[PDB]
């Protein structure tokens, strides 16, 4: 009966209305005519006002405030502001409500059953790229906990008419160099080619292991970036052996223990929060199955079937498959043994469930990107692969951004 | 807008420009994508008409006799016949390239690289439940040929505006009995559970099995269903058993040869063929991960670890991921030793690449549905993983339809 996408859990047979999508106001990339959910990245005034309006009435209701004269007249002190202005500010609990609804509101993340916890740094004062760096390396201290990780998120000035933005350039705060090799191949994560050789530009003195920190470089408005090494003893780092597999630890591979996203634009009530990290904790598979296995990043699954003594000349020995699990359960081995937060990819994934059952009570549905949530392997044995999903764009959001350069 | 689709392992992008031939609405708008949704929430003359006369043109083009006289003649033929008869009839050669094309067509299926090699049985001269049954049998046989399968499909009379449809109650030809103990538990395959009872009732003695291969219920037009036995040796089944584990025979698994689905919809220039089961040969993830595997299948991950004496008791042990692999192992094993025509996993998503490819320069593009086309187990250990894909509905196509009961 209900004239709102019908949603179905394979496993359970359950059914559920997403009512929610009715509250988008941005159209995504799909169409009648063909589906466009599975790229990953698909491509003021009057407009300023009525965003702002809404971003208002999200908040007082989320205080059960709505309709009262406090609302009422944050709205008034909201619209004589952008009159005079071009813009408007947002009052400190408000940008905390506003960065928590955008973890909420994140349709690629499986870690939201966490999202009611995150300390919201406020830096709306930070006035330099040497005040950046500070308010970076507190996060990264309060965040790391030495082990006991904790989510957080800090919030650097808004973009302003006129007046250049803040920006880190690095897509992380932790990333390990790629340095592009004479013989065309990389040494270190390819994926960070570009901005190893961004760091080198701006005077750099780069090392040449395959985990190599790279230092940030900060911009603050109107100004060229300055580079920043981090403090080694900042950057808690976990070496990777394995429960049983001896020679799994002279491999030297390691990870760190930090995923903090830095390249993200958090969008709150039409303002743009250019320059906002916000890091969790891992979940396994992150590392142990993308970072370490994607043919165009470390790309070791050759390496450790090898050292496993697998049969790599066929595919239908699952060397591949068999590597995998090995490399991932060496991930989740050497977290616990260096009591540093990690989640698996089915604990995490029940735990995303709950979410979803929270979710459809609390709001009506919830936003979600299958090919995202879903685990990169072992899928089909996790409860997430058995249930379908709505995706669309709701605000406050984290959205992609050009890079700076 | 044509969309840009990118290959993230290799940095290469290509413009799918087929979609724009779709007709048919899928379920996603620009407010909301509904592409992981498995099933359509949805399920006069002028418009047969334009769907055949477009049908007849993608005939005529293929064989590059279009424009000719034998293309004039025919779609005067097309038009005398519906305009007086309200329908029409399609030539054997047609329907042969329709069926093709339908596969060619299908989203969610990896195996298209084998999309030109397909014997096409015309049953459209059949009036009755036990000629179904004999042609039938003779595409079992055909199909199988003694293990070394070979794809096919049987076409059944179309839809036809006065009547009935033939139909085929199971969803495929060959499928193990469910059988609903009192005490809430399934015996056999779940997912059968409710056919099993309609052959039951329809009269079928049912033996106590978890491998107790399913009589047809096969239906001529307006006519009660009829209950047809299939003769043991036309049904080719492989013992399941581990290339090192011994125990794992000892487990009595098993499965069939011959993956016929018999219950979704053939449709070519705007005739419906309600009947038209079609086979290839199995994917081991199939059999190996989902049958097996899927909690509300035979769900047998457990009982495996726990032969393989896994830590069960907790998540981060990765028991479940370390029993799939000897599962899916064990059906490429007992497969490869029968002489039975499978593919793994890796070798079918690397001929789906050289598909996409050759589609790309044929056609312009390739409907595709990412969260089908990736394996339910080492998603991104294989290559579709890292490419992005357009789904969209072309015509001929493979469609849902209604249960007939
Ligand atoms: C608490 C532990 C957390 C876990 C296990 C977690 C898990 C994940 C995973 C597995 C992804 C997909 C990553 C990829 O494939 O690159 C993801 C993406 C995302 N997460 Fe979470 N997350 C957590 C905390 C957070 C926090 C605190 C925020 C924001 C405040 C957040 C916001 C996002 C956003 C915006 C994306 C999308 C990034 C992109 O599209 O590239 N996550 N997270
Ligand atoms: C040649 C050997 C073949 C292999 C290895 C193959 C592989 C697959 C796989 C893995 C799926 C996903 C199915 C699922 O998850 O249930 C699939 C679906 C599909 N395949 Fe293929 N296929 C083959 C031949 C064919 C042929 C001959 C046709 C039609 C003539 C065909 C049409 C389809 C259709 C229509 C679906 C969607 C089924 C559904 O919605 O449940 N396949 N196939
Ligand atoms: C596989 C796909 C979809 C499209 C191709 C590349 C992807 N990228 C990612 C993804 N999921 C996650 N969590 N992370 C990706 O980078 N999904
Ligand atoms: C996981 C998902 C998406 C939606 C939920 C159930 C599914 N069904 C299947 C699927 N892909 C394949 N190949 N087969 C399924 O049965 N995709
Ligand atoms: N668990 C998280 N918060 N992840 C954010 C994405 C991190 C990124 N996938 C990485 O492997 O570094
Ligand atoms: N390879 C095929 N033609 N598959 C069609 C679907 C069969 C279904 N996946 C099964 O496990 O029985
Ligand atoms: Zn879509």
């Given at each position: 009966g209900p004239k709102f996408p019908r949603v179905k859990n394979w496993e359970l047979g359950s059914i559920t209305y997403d009512t929610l999508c009715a509250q988008s106001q941005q159209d995504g990339p799909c169409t009648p005519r063909r589906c466009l959910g599975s790229l990953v990245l698909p491509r003021p005034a009057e407009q300023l006002l009525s965003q702002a309006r809404d971003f208002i009435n999200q908040y007082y209701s989320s205080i059960k405030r709505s309709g009262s004269q406090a609302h009422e007249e944050r709205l008034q002190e909201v619209e004589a502001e952008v009159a005079s202005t071009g813009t408007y500010h947002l009052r400190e609990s408000e940008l905390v409500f506003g960065a928590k609804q955008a973890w909420r509101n994140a349709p690629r993340c499986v870690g939201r059953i966490q999202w009611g916890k995150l300390q919201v740094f406020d830096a709306r004062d930070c006035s330099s790229a040497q005040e950046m760096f500070t308010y970076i390396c507190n996060h990264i201290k309060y965040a790391t906990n030495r082990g006991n990780l904790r989510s957080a998120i800090t919030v650097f000035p808004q973009r302003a008419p006129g007046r250049g933005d803040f920006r880190?350039?690095?897509?992380?705060?932790v990333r390990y160099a790629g340095y592009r090799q004479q013989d065309g191949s990389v040494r270190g994560d390819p994926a960070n080619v570009e901005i190893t050789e961004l760091c080198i530009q701006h005077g750099w003195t780069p090392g040449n292991g395959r985990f190599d920190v790279l230092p940030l470089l900060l911009q603050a408005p109107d100004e060229a970036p300055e580079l920043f090494v981090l403090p080694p003893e900042l950057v808690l780092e976990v070496p990777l052996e394995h429960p049983t597999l001896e020679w799994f630890a002279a491999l030297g591979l390691r990870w760190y223990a930090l995923p903090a996203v830095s390249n993200m634009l958090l969008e709150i009530g039409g303002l743009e929060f250019s320059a906002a990290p916000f890091s969790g904790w891992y979940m396994s598979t992150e590392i142990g199955t993308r970072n370490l296995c994607d043919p165009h990043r470390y790309n070791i699954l050759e390496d450790v079937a090898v050292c496993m003594d697998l049969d790599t000349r066929t595919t239908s020995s699952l060397w591949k498959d068999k590597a995998a699990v090995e490399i991932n359960l060496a991930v989740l081995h050497s977290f616990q043994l260096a009591k540093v937060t990690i989640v698996d990819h089915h604990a995490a994934t029940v735990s995303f469930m709950k979410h979803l059952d929270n979710e459809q009570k609390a709001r009506g549905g919830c936003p979600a990107d299958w090919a995202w949530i879903v685990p990169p392997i072992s899928g089909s044995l996790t409860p997430v692969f058995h249930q379908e999903m709505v995706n669309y764009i709701l605000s406050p959001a984290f959205r992609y951004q050009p890079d700076p350069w």
């Open positions: 880190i350039w690095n897509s992380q705060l």
